[PDB]
Amino acid sequence: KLKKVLDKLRLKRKDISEAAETVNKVVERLLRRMQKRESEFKGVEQLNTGSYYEHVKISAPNEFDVMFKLEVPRIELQEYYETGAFYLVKFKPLSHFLEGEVLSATKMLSKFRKIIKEEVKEIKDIDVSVEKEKPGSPAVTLLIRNPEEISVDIILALESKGSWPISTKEGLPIQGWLGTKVRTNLRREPFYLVPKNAKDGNSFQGETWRLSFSHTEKYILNNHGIEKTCCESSGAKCCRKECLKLMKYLLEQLKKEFQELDAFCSYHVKTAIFHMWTQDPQDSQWDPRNLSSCFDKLLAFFLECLRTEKLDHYFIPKFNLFSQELIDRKSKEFLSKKIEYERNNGFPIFD
DNA sequence: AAATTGCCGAAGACG
DNA sequence: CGTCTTCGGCAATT
Ligand SMILES: Nc1ncnc2c1ncn2[C@@H]1O[C@H](COP(=O)(O)OP(=O)(O)OP(=O)(O)O)[C@@H](O)[C@H]1O
Ligand SMILES: [Mg+2]
Ligand SMILES: [Mg+2]
Ligand SMILES: [Zn+2]
């Protein structure tokens, strides 16, 4: 039954090919423009992130996330209040994005958006436009007709090679699952900041940046087993990724018909299952034969997070994604009832 | 330093 | 299942 649903959610190679060919052409062209002399962004490198590249995109290859990352050496961080996630950036070029001593996310991003705008109107062979700007959002979204509709979020990110901000010190609790060498290695990789503004201190503090761990999350998806051979050709398949797909599908459907579930996103589901993977590390607990019950354990845990109004950011424990701020209580109760109904009625929404 | 290429894992297709 | 193919990611290469 859930196996029936997964077959339906499974992407088609023909769709993958047509979408990727077009996506790749457009991004390569944008990345190249960014390298032109006397651009502030002359060092950016591409990093493919998110659902599609983690092989957990469902239904159709119609949304792509791409990070353009800029190495900005010698940066001082000041935590914005007590969030753990949001920061103000100072320096120890790009000398016109300033606001006193503060590197403005808004200025750096607006200029980033402007250059993408000009390049896109130069594109004649492909139907592509730039989506209306979303306040506080860090992405410049391309809208593509191939003729099928595809979205590409291009995300400017500052790369810093120093050790991670202390708010992350108790995060990434993978010691009993992926282990201590993996955790230590992952934390010597750089950290990233994206120009997503903090909505606190009404409304958006235009200078604020947000921590991003898209790279770390990507590695974990591709190295998710307690055993090194999990999902390899000389190893055993697990159902970790397929549980994630089923939970994303559920939310995605619920969001489709209830506007009151805006402000929930797939990241909430992704965060909830990373916690689950930590709680249940053994690969044997994620055997394909036990798919139904793993999904049920995920659901019960997600409800428990919903009911207690707490979902700890996997990398930043201080940061509650389900605080009273960010998401209203009633919105959580609403989602609790919908889930509880679909759970007790064999998931009719799956059709 | 910018493109080209070789390598192979993850996973879709198919029987 | 086993086998075949494509896409993505890496970095040596010139
Ligand atoms: N609210 C958030 N907090 C922290 N990181 C986020 C948040 N939203 C998105 N991200 C990062 O950006 C990436 C892309 O976000 P997006 O909303 O496209 O979801 P996704 O993981 O690609 O899943 P899907 O595209 O299938 O909804 C995520 O994988 C995540 O790492
Ligand atoms: Mg996405
Ligand atoms: Mg996105
Ligand atoms: Zn696995």
Side-chain angles (χ1 to χ4, degrees), chain A residues 263-275:
Chain A
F264 294 105
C265 63
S266 59
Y267 200 67
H268 299 140
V269 167
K270 197 179 172 187
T271 306
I273 212 188
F274 277 25
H275 282 289

PDB file of all heavy atoms in Angstrom, chain A residues 263-275:
ATOM      1  N   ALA A 263       3.352  28.361   6.396  1.00  0.00           N
ATOM      2  CA  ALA A 263       4.348  28.446   7.481  1.00  0.00           C
ATOM      3  C   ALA A 263       4.870  27.094   7.977  1.00  0.00           C
ATOM      4  O   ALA A 263       5.783  27.051   8.798  1.00  0.00           O
ATOM      5  CB  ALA A 263       3.866  29.319   8.666  1.00  0.00           C
ATOM      6  N   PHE A 264       4.293  25.999   7.495  1.00  0.00           N
ATOM      7  CA  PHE A 264       4.960  24.701   7.599  1.00  0.00           C
ATOM      8  C   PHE A 264       5.684  24.465   6.277  1.00  0.00           C
ATOM      9  O   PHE A 264       5.265  24.992   5.248  1.00  0.00           O
ATOM     10  CB  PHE A 264       3.957  23.575   7.860  1.00  0.00           C
ATOM     11  CG  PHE A 264       3.260  23.666   9.196  1.00  0.00           C
ATOM     12  CD1 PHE A 264       1.940  24.083   9.277  1.00  0.00           C
ATOM     13  CD2 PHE A 264       3.922  23.318  10.370  1.00  0.00           C
ATOM     14  CE1 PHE A 264       1.291  24.156  10.501  1.00  0.00           C
ATOM     15  CE2 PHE A 264       3.284  23.387  11.599  1.00  0.00           C
ATOM     16  CZ  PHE A 264       1.966  23.809  11.666  1.00  0.00           C
ATOM     17  N   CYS A 265       6.770  23.730   6.328  1.00  0.00           N
ATOM     18  CA  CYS A 265       7.580  23.460   5.166  1.00  0.00           C
ATOM     19  C   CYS A 265       8.185  22.092   5.253  1.00  0.00           C
ATOM     20  O   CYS A 265       8.064  21.430   6.233  1.00  0.00           O
ATOM     21  CB  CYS A 265       8.655  24.503   4.992  1.00  0.00           C
ATOM     22  SG  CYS A 265       9.814  24.560   6.310  1.00  0.00           S
ATOM     23  N   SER A 266       8.792  21.660   4.180  1.00  0.00           N
ATOM     24  CA  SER A 266       9.433  20.375   4.155  1.00  0.00           C
ATOM     25  C   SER A 266      10.581  20.261   5.116  1.00  0.00           C
ATOM     26  O   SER A 266      10.845  19.205   5.555  1.00  0.00           O
ATOM     27  CB  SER A 266       9.794  19.938   2.748  1.00  0.00           C
ATOM     28  OG  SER A 266      10.638  20.819   2.116  1.00  0.00           O
ATOM     29  N   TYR A 267      11.273  21.345   5.404  1.00  0.00           N
ATOM     30  CA  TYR A 267      12.354  21.314   6.400  1.00  0.00           C
ATOM     31  C   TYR A 267      11.925  20.831   7.781  1.00  0.00           C
ATOM     32  O   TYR A 267      12.677  20.136   8.455  1.00  0.00           O
ATOM     33  CB  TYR A 267      13.021  22.680   6.535  1.00  0.00           C
ATOM     34  CG  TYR A 267      14.392  22.589   7.145  1.00  0.00           C
ATOM     35  CD1 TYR A 267      15.425  21.962   6.459  1.00  0.00           C
ATOM     36  CD2 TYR A 267      14.659  23.117   8.404  1.00  0.00           C
ATOM     37  CE1 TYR A 267      16.694  21.870   7.000  1.00  0.00           C
ATOM     38  CE2 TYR A 267      15.924  23.030   8.955  1.00  0.00           C
ATOM     39  CZ  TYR A 267      16.940  22.401   8.242  1.00  0.00           C
ATOM     40  OH  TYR A 267      18.200  22.297   8.772  1.00  0.00           O
ATOM     41  N   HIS A 268      10.729  21.216   8.214  1.00  0.00           N
ATOM     42  CA  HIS A 268      10.192  20.676   9.458  1.00  0.00           C
ATOM     43  C   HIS A 268      10.203  19.145   9.424  1.00  0.00           C
ATOM     44  O   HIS A 268      10.550  18.492  10.409  1.00  0.00           O
ATOM     45  CB  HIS A 268       8.773  21.177   9.695  1.00  0.00           C
ATOM     46  CG  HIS A 268       8.683  22.660   9.824  1.00  0.00           C
ATOM     47  ND1 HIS A 268       7.660  23.398   9.267  1.00  0.00           N
ATOM     48  CD2 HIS A 268       9.491  23.550  10.447  1.00  0.00           C
ATOM     49  CE1 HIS A 268       7.842  24.675   9.543  1.00  0.00           C
ATOM     50  NE2 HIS A 268       8.947  24.795  10.256  1.00  0.00           N
ATOM     51  N   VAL A 269       9.822  18.571   8.291  1.00  0.00           N
ATOM     52  CA  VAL A 269       9.766  17.123   8.186  1.00  0.00           C
ATOM     53  C   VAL A 269      11.177  16.544   8.165  1.00  0.00           C
ATOM     54  O   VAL A 269      11.458  15.537   8.814  1.00  0.00           O
ATOM     55  CB  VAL A 269       8.953  16.685   6.948  1.00  0.00           C
ATOM     56  CG1 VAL A 269       9.151  15.212   6.658  1.00  0.00           C
ATOM     57  CG2 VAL A 269       7.481  16.974   7.171  1.00  0.00           C
ATOM     58  N   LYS A 270      12.068  17.213   7.443  1.00  0.00           N
ATOM     59  CA  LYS A 270      13.466  16.790   7.326  1.00  0.00           C
ATOM     60  C   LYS A 270      14.146  16.797   8.702  1.00  0.00           C
ATOM     61  O   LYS A 270      14.812  15.830   9.097  1.00  0.00           O
ATOM     62  CB  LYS A 270      14.201  17.700   6.325  1.00  0.00           C
ATOM     63  CG  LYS A 270      15.533  17.164   5.783  1.00  0.00           C
ATOM     64  CD  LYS A 270      16.126  18.183   4.787  1.00  0.00           C
ATOM     65  CE  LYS A 270      17.547  17.826   4.355  1.00  0.00           C
ATOM     66  NZ  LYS A 270      18.168  18.918   3.532  1.00  0.00           N
ATOM     67  N   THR A 271      13.954  17.883   9.436  1.00  0.00           N
ATOM     68  CA  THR A 271      14.460  17.984  10.806  1.00  0.00           C
ATOM     69  C   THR A 271      13.889  16.906  11.725  1.00  0.00           C
ATOM     70  O   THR A 271      14.617  16.319  12.524  1.00  0.00           O
ATOM     71  CB  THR A 271      14.160  19.365  11.410  1.00  0.00           C
ATOM     72  OG1 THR A 271      14.666  20.375  10.528  1.00  0.00           O
ATOM     73  CG2 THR A 271      14.815  19.502  12.791  1.00  0.00           C
ATOM     74  N   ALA A 272      12.597  16.624  11.603  1.00  0.00           N
ATOM     75  CA  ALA A 272      11.979  15.620  12.467  1.00  0.00           C
ATOM     76  C   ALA A 272      12.571  14.219  12.234  1.00  0.00           C
ATOM     77  O   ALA A 272      12.751  13.437  13.180  1.00  0.00           O
ATOM     78  CB  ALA A 272      10.474  15.614  12.287  1.00  0.00           C
ATOM     79  N   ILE A 273      12.893  13.905  10.984  1.00  0.00           N
ATOM     80  CA  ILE A 273      13.435  12.579  10.682  1.00  0.00           C
ATOM     81  C   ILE A 273      14.933  12.442  10.990  1.00  0.00           C
ATOM     82  O   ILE A 273      15.380  11.351  11.383  1.00  0.00           O
ATOM     83  CB  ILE A 273      13.073  12.088   9.247  1.00  0.00           C
ATOM     84  CG1 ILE A 273      12.930  10.560   9.229  1.00  0.00           C
ATOM     85  CG2 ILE A 273      14.080  12.584   8.213  1.00  0.00           C
ATOM     86  CD1 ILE A 273      12.766   9.979   7.863  1.00  0.00           C
ATOM     87  N   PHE A 274      15.703  13.529  10.845  1.00  0.00           N
ATOM     88  CA  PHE A 274      17.088  13.497  11.322  1.00  0.00           C
ATOM     89  C   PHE A 274      17.099  13.110  12.797  1.00  0.00           C
ATOM     90  O   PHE A 274      17.970  12.348  13.224  1.00  0.00           O
ATOM     91  CB  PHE A 274      17.821  14.833  11.140  1.00  0.00           C
ATOM     92  CG  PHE A 274      18.395  15.050   9.756  1.00  0.00           C
ATOM     93  CD1 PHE A 274      17.865  14.411   8.642  1.00  0.00           C
ATOM     94  CD2 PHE A 274      19.479  15.898   9.577  1.00  0.00           C
ATOM     95  CE1 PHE A 274      18.402  14.623   7.367  1.00  0.00           C
ATOM     96  CE2 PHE A 274      20.031  16.111   8.314  1.00  0.00           C
ATOM     97  CZ  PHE A 274      19.487  15.472   7.203  1.00  0.00           C
ATOM     98  N   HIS A 275      16.131  13.624  13.570  1.00  0.00           N
ATOM     99  CA  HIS A 275      16.060  13.315  15.005  1.00  0.00           C
ATOM    100  C   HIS A 275      15.753  11.855  15.196  1.00  0.00           C
ATOM    101  O   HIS A 275      16.311  11.201  16.074  1.00  0.00           O
ATOM    102  CB  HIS A 275      15.022  14.183  15.739  1.00  0.00           C
ATOM    103  CG  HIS A 275      15.492  15.576  16.031  1.00  0.00           C
ATOM    104  ND1 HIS A 275      16.461  15.855  16.970  1.00  0.00           N
ATOM    105  CD2 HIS A 275      15.126  16.771  15.504  1.00  0.00           C
ATOM    106  CE1 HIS A 275      16.671  17.160  17.012  1.00  0.00           C
ATOM    107  NE2 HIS A 275      15.876  17.738  16.132  1.00  0.00           N
TER     108      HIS A 275
END
